[PDB]
Design an enzyme around this catalytic site. Structure first.
Site, PDB file in Angstrom:
ATOM      1  N   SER A   1     -54.846 -45.008 -12.235  1.00  0.00           N
ATOM      2  CA  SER A   1     -53.622 -44.254 -11.936  1.00  0.00           C
ATOM      3  C   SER A   1     -53.579 -42.949 -12.733  1.00  0.00           C
ATOM      4  O   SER A   1     -52.811 -42.040 -12.437  1.00  0.00           O
ATOM      5  CB  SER A   1     -52.367 -45.090 -12.193  1.00  0.00           C
TER       6      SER A   1
ATOM      7  N   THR B   1     -54.768 -51.201 -13.767  1.00  0.00           N
ATOM      8  CA  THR B   1     -55.200 -52.253 -14.695  1.00  0.00           C
ATOM      9  C   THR B   1     -54.983 -53.673 -14.155  1.00  0.00           C
ATOM     10  O   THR B   1     -55.730 -54.590 -14.508  1.00  0.00           O
ATOM     11  CB  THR B   1     -54.506 -52.119 -16.065  1.00  0.00           C
TER      12      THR B   1
ATOM     13  N   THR C   1     -50.453 -48.433 -14.424  1.00  0.00           N
ATOM     14  CA  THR C   1     -49.224 -48.159 -15.166  1.00  0.00           C
ATOM     15  C   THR C   1     -49.034 -46.696 -15.594  1.00  0.00           C
ATOM     16  O   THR C   1     -47.902 -46.235 -15.715  1.00  0.00           O
ATOM     17  CB  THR C   1     -49.103 -49.051 -16.411  1.00  0.00           C
TER      18      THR C   1
END
Lengths: 325, 327, 327, 327
Positions: free
Chosen positions: C59, C12, C91
């Site tokens: 991720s 992000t 994250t």
């Protein structure tokens, strides 16, 4: 047709600027300039604004609380739909609880601030303001009580406390937990606060120019605050809130002196230096006049004791207030 | 078995009340250390247990004299062969006593404070398992050179981090900034962390020839702050230093700070702390020049401990500041 | 001026989307890593900075390939004189990558993972501050031999303790068991703990010659649990170990556990983790004879990393269990 | 005087182990519910107590049948004059049972679940104070129409928000997102909040005629996710709905997710949750159109409860989503 929202500025890091962009700790900025960082704010409401104060909130004072309460009631009478108060974080919790006990409308009153100045990298002020405006126009925002909106969380005045001194995520309700959360202008309520507020609180400050003098002492090992209490009483202090250890324990050095002063007319509220929990005041001490602040922290306990002293001088009636508001 | 000394100072773990339901209106320090111990026969399996009543007070009435007495008693115990010490203690000021001991005891041998949130007479009494766990910790091999420890509700907290954070709940203590040293499962000790702030043999404070400490008091700050009246009277009545529980990151209302500035110029030391539970305070370079000292992350009552001890070595705010960064 | 390499992985922090107020429906890994650097000019003041795009993915879609490459590329860099490494990462699984690298990097030089909760294009985007702080950390003289770390929202978390504990808030990460390594304020690094669990140079895992890792999958436990059917299928399709997220402290529903028992007998490794965010799991003596391995406090996805690496060296449950006690 | 039924399901609160020190390894569900009641005499002063043993099991082995039995028994007792109910329950799946009841009991009368983290026989066992508080709560005049509740460790938590967040500590429960409803101080109840989400009367589920529930299972997402295999197996063996514990805000690794898309086209209901304890899940319009349903802030196991009750009314993803927004 858009809701008419008024923003009342009081100062704070949210409208501050520092020369560096990496630096967070501390001149002043105009609120128009704040809005140009979140233009779309003008899409949520037709926005009008006024300056009630321009200070670091650490320097808050009674006069400011009085004006705010009177200003808000005036604008609500003129068809303002909701109010956003730009405020500094240090004493936001104090201002919030005050207005929560003095504003008769069911209309949305939201306090908002920022942990990082407007010129810092990753400044949290723009988003916070956006969310605050989004909160006051939302249809479910009526009758909630005065609220704090910071870092996507909605906190009740009655429960809100500053719990981190540096972190963007700085606020909490250690005993109640949040009223709700905001996800990109989308408001979601989780709770209704039970404690009575606003129209249902009996405090009327419309005629007042000053408030009863209430001050705050602390308790600790080898407590030497007895000296400070006598001196405060001799200088016009009408009430003392004590930040006791654990569940409202006041060290005997200090407690003997407060006992003396009770018999001379001082009001004493027992609070706590501990972030979460309620205090306990024995039946014995209550008989002497000691008032329990329940779960209310010292600076919030001061707010309610002050307002209580505008109505009564009777510790039993004051205790009733602390049980209800 | 290893030789372990348990010292009583009173507290709720030794508290009494006729009702079994009640946990709020009791008398602290109503029970002898040697009675609490018989209630948990198993701790006698863990070690060679000896005991002593240093005091039997409510910890809210703690005072320097007991601190001094306790540091000397512990020095003497270790010097005559004792392997570790448990201190039973009220919860109210436990965090104060622990941090004082952290900075004054010259041994690597384990020192553990323990208490209860419920009186020993209560249903689901708190104290028994807490005492058991405290003894298990101080006998553990990894417990040396850890610094002074508070062991309560199965958690191991460091002197330097521990803060009472709930006033009623059995889970009452945490390290808002640092985080726990470890955890205790049925007598079994697990460490997670080493605390990095210097301690014990590495803290330069010596209280062994002292019968009193420099007077340090605490003030608060809030809207319409009136503590100014207070600061001047404390200063006039012999107060040597003031810790201020500032709002935010150590901000002090202008009414009080003005007076503080006056008193700085007259020899008062001022340490800036926070009424906020987690985080550090910030003090501007210019206030630092005036003499305001940053409490860093220490809260007002713990900041008072460090300032007090710092005044037994130095009067130089510059150096007091170096201590606050290190210990 | 330290020589610092920044490795772009995506996430992000490199996120994009048309609206500025928007935060949910962005496109993670749309922005090239060098763009993000230019946006924080003060960064080039902290170190001699270099960079390279190892990948630009979500991720959510992390894999063994990327982990193996990432660990080799870092090994390389530290042997070419690089002083520290910053890894910009999504994250969602940062905690898994972090723990992997913590057990696989043979250097004592700082490795800091950083990410953002808001896409780089949003108002009040957190990415730039976070990236600044991570560079400040890796350049810090005291960041040596601390383990692989995560630097986000001003907090410094150890790889062995870090978990995402909020899905939307910029305050997204914590260590529910260890607690923070330290804090950052305005570029200044403050350390509170050293984590005692061994890591990096002291972890016996070598992946330099592996092009793939043992297959390890994760199952969940709940009321009326139907996972038994899943366990069998996994096993039939090459699964070498299964981590179970039990209820409470590693309780596995009798429906799943009975299947897990038959599978243990056929070569399957089983690690008991938990779905509860903090605490330790407790496996009974008799379950452990069967071959059940306790994950201790490791969460399921992190426990997966250790079991997987464990299987590069052994398939003896008794020794994997030792690995879980130490790393 | 109010008539209160105490329903036993077992759990650690009825646990027994030989040691008074030990707190793990015990057999949960060993003690009769009447023995637990007779252990705390004062409970008889709060109300006219009756009791029935519904099951005596480890709550990690909870199942649908016990749920249906509980729901029906409560409805019956309430219609026959009982003023409140307390259910003693294991802590492992208490979230799940609590939330099931929240959605299926058509009465405003208090229902309170209670348990303990220490076996009955352990020192400082928590069970007795918890059982006392729970009865005081269900007896409180303010306890009506609050929704189903969990009372444990002096805290009052709503079914809608309650989650087990520590696996070992006595303070094991919180509401990551909703926070607490109130607190108990020696049977003294204090309420702070009303949860806003519809419950009980205003929930549309009716299990009065059900002998079985729709089969809903749970999977987990993680780096290199291999859950696709388990998903195919679960579907084929009868699973009607799967909840996925996604990474971060409901992200599902592509490997599993591509398989779920294929399964969506075969009539599988898919609900997207999170392995992350606090926060709310995000689903794109595009994914919603395929039929992915957001669990919002509901964790995997509680989301299972709601997906399962929804399936007793409709298989329409659009309709099920409306339920997840309201209950």
């Amino acid at each position: 047709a858009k809701s008419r929202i008024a923003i009342l500025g009081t100062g704070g890091t949210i409208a501050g600027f520092i020369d560096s962009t990496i630096a967070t700790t501390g001149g002043a900025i105009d609120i128009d300039v704040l809005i140009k960082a979140v233009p779309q704010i003008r899409d949520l409401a037709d926005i009008s604004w006024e300056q009630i104060a321009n200070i670091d909130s650490s320097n808050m004072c009674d006069e400011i609380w009085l004006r705010l309460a009177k200003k808000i009631a005036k604008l609500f009478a003129e068809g303002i739909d909701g109010v956003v108060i730009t405020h500094g974080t240090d004493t936001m919790e104090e201002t919030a609880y005050f207005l929560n006990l003095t504003i008769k409308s069911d209309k949305p009153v939201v306090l908002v601030g920022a942990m990082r100045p407007s010129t810092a990298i990753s400044a949290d002020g723009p988003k916070n303001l956006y969310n605050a405006v989004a909160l006051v126009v939302n249809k479910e925002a009526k009758n909630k009580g005065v609220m704090v909106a910071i870092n996507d969380k909605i906190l009740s005045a009655r429960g809100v406390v500053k719990t981190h001194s540096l972190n963007v995520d700085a606020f909490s309700s250690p005993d109640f937990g949040d009223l709700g959360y905001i996800v990109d202008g989308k408001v979601f309520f989780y709770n209704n606060v039970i404690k009575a507020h606003t129209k249902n609180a009996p405090f009327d400050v419309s005629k007042l120019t000053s408030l009863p003098k209430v001050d705050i002492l602390y308790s600790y090992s080898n407590d030497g605050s007895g000296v400070a209490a006598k001196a405060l009483f001799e200088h016009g202090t009408k009430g003392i809130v004590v930040a006791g250890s654990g569940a409202g324990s006041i060290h005997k050095n200090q407690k003997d002196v407060l006992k003396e002063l009770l018999k001379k007319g001082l009001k004493v509220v027992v609070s706590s230096r501990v972030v979460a929990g309620c205090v306990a005041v024995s039946d014995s001490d209550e008989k002497l006049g000691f008032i329990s602040a329940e779960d209310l922290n010292p600076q919030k306990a001061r707010v309610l004791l002050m307002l209580a002293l505008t109505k009564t001088s009777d510790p039993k009636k004051i205790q009733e207030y602390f049980l209800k508001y």
